[model samples]
Target chain A: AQSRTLLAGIVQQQQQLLDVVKRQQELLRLTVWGTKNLQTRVTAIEKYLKDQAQLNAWGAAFRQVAHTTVPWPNASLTPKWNNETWQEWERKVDFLEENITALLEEAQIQQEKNMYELQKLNS
Target chain B: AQSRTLLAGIVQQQQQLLDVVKRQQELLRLTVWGTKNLQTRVTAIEKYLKDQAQLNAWGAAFRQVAHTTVPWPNASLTPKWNNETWQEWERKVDFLEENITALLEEAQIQQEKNMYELQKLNS
Candidate 1:
């Protein structure tokens, strides 16, 4: 091939690679932004988890006290609670569970969406 | 400029962008993998949170019982647990906290690194 022609072909290939690279860079920008967003949710979850642990410790203490009593002596508090308190606990715990579930699912879907894009990137 | 010379300058630009793009993609791949890893941590935290709520219900019941007891009763279980269980609770909660902090910090650092790369990419 003439020198010019050879240079032409080489330039074409470089341009192709550039196209791919540009696409990838935009994706990377999104990923960087997305990770920062992910960090936000993760920190929220971490904070919530700390409170959960505290609540668990509080609960364990309560069960220990029940263990000392005579009636309902299996050390289980399941049957002893009145309707009002039981309903209240149910409502509160349910709310917490719903909120956390939403966060988890949102994060999961974001991951899955990114994975699909990655599959295309791999292609 | 001759067509050949014009092509020459264009190819160099593509080449340079290609360099930037390649680095960006590598960072992206690592991030894709990291987000997958993050999904794992978030799910684990979610599951643990569920159990914590269940445990909280168990604890709240005990407080109600203490409410019924008159002698030295304040509806609180704070000063009641024997040493062994409390220590065990400490270890377990501390372990959970430490592990999660590690995951959260790892994710944060990964994000910070990406942001820095983005700055370079912009340059």
Candidate 2:
């Protein structure tokens, strides 16, 4: 009988934690996937910028999209899919996402041209 | 005579329940630790991102932000019982995993799409 009593209390504790764990897991999943999703976007943007630093228009569009608004949006580390400002800016940068190939060629050709200019200047 | 068999079965059920409860306790402990420990990495990235927002060199700066990895413990939203004895509880946790998996696919498609987008950029 004593054992049954103890077992009943243990079972109750299990029920309690099960509830807590489920709720806590909800946030954990969000945290894990949220930041990682931010990682993916930030990565794409970083690469776009790194590769496109020598270019003109796309980043001009980027800065305009990012900084033009009053409640200016920065790239948040905990990203959400429904950020309206980001969605707006992201659509603007669609030019990059949609046409990055030709732009890359344009930038690289520009990159090499700048390289040549630097080399000639130093020489 | 039937009472003896039923009572024996109930005792066995309690023992089984206790073992599962023990495993769940371990899982709960790890989960508590993981939650408390998560604040630092998230804060680190926020400041890093805020500073990067100030620069034209956001690409390099974000890369620096990403250089620091989040500290994660040996914890998972899906309990690693190699299984769990609680099928119903397992179902809910697995549902969370299913949600994350769908989000994962979304990010993947987005990531791959961004790469393909960039593929057109430089060449």
Candidate 3:
């Protein structure tokens, strides 16, 4: 009778462990999905930033010839007129790109960690 | 004995439903987090796009004065020189802003849906 009670206790413990592992597996799956979605969004943002930097440089050239009195299409527009502002925009774009890359790298690391844990649980 | 078995079945069904509700709640939380993150990114992108449009107009004025032979900061960097290209860029920026706005709206809708579902599960 004592052995029967001991066997029942062991079974209960196994069941509890099984449930814990299942929940962990589910959590890992959801995390992977979220990380991937974030990566996609960040990548799209990076592309837009690149385009902004290029356009800003072109605009900086035009600011030099800008006249309050003259309409557009007149030839006062010159290069490097507002170079400082363009540079600032470029710097911001570079910073954002670096941030996105860092985030993507971190997400990949997290994915690996979760996968490793999942493997162990499976085994 | 039959009544006891019936009671056990009912309890089992209740536990199953309880687990489902817990999972649904977790899903709702994650969805909210994701939507908020997406909205933040979209807002940032929109700001950049607006800046680009303003800069492109300024650059269009320069392209008119633009002389490839003259070094930058020279007066020949005329306005309206590359007006066409700048206009193209302006169009692209406008399009991107619209796209971001639509995506933000969709995310908000998704968040609302998730919240409603969560409430139902809780009740």
Best by DockQ: 1
Range of the 10 consecutive residues with the lowest summed lDDT in candidate 2 chain A: A51-60
Calculate DockQ per candidate and list them. Answer: 0.14, 0.02, 0.07
Q: Taking the tens digit of each residue's C-alpha lDDT, what string does model 2 give over B16-120? A: 554554465466557645643553464465455444433332232222333222222211222543235334444665676555445444434543443343334
lDDT of each: 0.47, 0.43, 0.46
The C-alpha stretches of model 2 lying farther than 4 A from their native spots are A1-73, A76-123, B46-123
Off by over 4 Å in 3: A1-35, A38-42, A57-123, B1-6, B57-123
Clashing pairs in 1: A59-B59
Q: Rank the candidates by TM-score, best first.
A: 1, 3, 2
Give the top-scoring candidate (lDDT): 1
Which is the better candidate, 2 or 3, if ranked by lDDT? 3
Candidate 3 chain A weakest lDDT stretch, 10 residues: A69-78
Model 1: residues with Cα > 4 Å off, grouped in runs: A50-123, B1-27, B57-123
> TM-score of model 2, chain A?
0.33
Q: Against the true structure, what is model 1's DockQ?
A: 0.14
